Amino acid sequence: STNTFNYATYHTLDEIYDFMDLLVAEHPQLVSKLQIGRSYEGRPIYVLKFSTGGSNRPAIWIDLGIHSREWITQATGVWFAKKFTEDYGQDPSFTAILDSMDIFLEIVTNPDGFAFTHSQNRLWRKTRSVTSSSLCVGVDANRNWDAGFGKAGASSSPCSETYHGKYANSEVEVKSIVDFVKDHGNFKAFLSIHSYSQLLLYPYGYTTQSIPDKTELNQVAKSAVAALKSLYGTSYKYGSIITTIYQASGGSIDWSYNQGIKYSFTFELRDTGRYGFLLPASQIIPTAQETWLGVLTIMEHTV
Numbered sequence: 001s002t003n004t005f006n007y008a009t010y011h012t013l014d015e016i017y018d019f020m021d022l023l024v025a026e027h028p029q030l031v032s033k034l035q036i037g038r039s040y041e042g043r044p045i046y047v048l049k050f051s052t053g054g055s056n057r058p059a060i061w062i063d064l065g066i067h068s069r070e071w072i073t074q075a076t077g078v079w080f081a082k083k084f085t086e087d088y089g090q091d092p093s094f095t096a097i098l099d100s101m102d103i104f105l106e107i108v109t110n111p112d113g114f115a116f117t118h119s120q121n122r123l124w125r126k127t128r129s130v131t132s133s134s135l136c137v138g139v140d141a142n143r144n145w146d147a148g149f150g151k152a153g154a155s156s157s158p159c160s161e162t163y164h165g166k167y168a169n170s171e172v173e174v175k176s177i178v179d180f181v182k183d184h185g186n187f188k189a190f191l192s193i194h195s196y197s198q199l200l201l202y203p204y205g206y207t208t209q210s211i212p213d214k215t216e217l218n219q220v221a222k223s224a225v226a227a228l229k230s231l232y233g234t235s236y237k238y239g240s241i242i243t244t245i246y247q248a249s250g251g252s253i254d255w256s257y258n259q260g261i262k263y264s265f266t267f268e269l270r271d272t273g274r275y276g277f278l279l280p281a282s283q284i285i286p287t288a289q290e291t292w293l294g295v296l297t298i299m300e301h302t303v
């Protein structure tokens with residue numbers, strides 16, 4: 001059962017997929033599993049929908065693991081999923097959110113890369129699509145979005161860690177989300193979960209242009225980082241992607257914000273470089289707990 005699932009360890013693709021089914025079976029009135037596409041290598045791509053009813057209620061999107069080696073993100077996603085089912089009907093604030101809004105949680109946004117990190121190369125980041133005119137495999141799926149696609153802050157070199165791919169939305173892992181979010185039409189928040197650096201970022205990455213909602217998103221981010229820090233003292237920086245970390249093009253929240261999804265944020269979770277992508281399992285639960293406080297704060301602002 002999800003009560004005996006080990007949240008303090010890293011899991012395989014199959015384990016996470018089986019966890020999804022267990023959670024849905026345990027909480028059939030709250031959680032359902034949606035297949036939003038198939039990966040390049042034909043694996044199902046799944047989103048958990050948390051809902052207490054209604055018809056396409058205002059929604060929060062959360063993607064985790066788009067960069068496959070960022071294992072703290074999938075592990076955080078699993079914890080989030082369980083936490084949602086525990087706190088609905090117990091925590092006043094979260095209960096208020098789910099009574100009026102739906103949450104769509106994509107724990108393994110890049111399943112082919114995730115499988116590869118378990119079977120072949122722990123440090124695999126990209127998708128597994130094969131570039132026809134190339135010995136190289138995969139695209140940086142967080143540089144493949146139709147937001148400043150192909151502009152400075154991504155690489156045109158197919159072997160690069162930061163390769164943007166041949167055209168915007170070339171990667172089915174990205175296009176699956178784009179289609180789902182567009183078809184849905186009522187997303188109000190869009191949160192992309194990454195590691196590492198301890199940053200909470202709002203748009204843009206591709207341009208120095210200030211978003212029209214900068215004052216608001218900046219204060220939301222300030223509040224969220226304070227909430228996150230309150231638990232273990234984990235210090236996050238916050239601001240626009242381009243001012244806070246680097247220019248980066250073809251990114252998820254730049255795309256979502258340009259669709260009119262106002263509360264668009266990217267979290268870069270622990271740490272700041274000591275372990276980097278190889279974050280010890282002993283930090284999974286503390287990371288998930290503090291990150292939840294930040295995420296819940298954003299959801300509260302979305303209302």
Ligand SMILES: [Zn+2]
Binds near residue numbers: 142
């Ligand atoms: Zn990342």
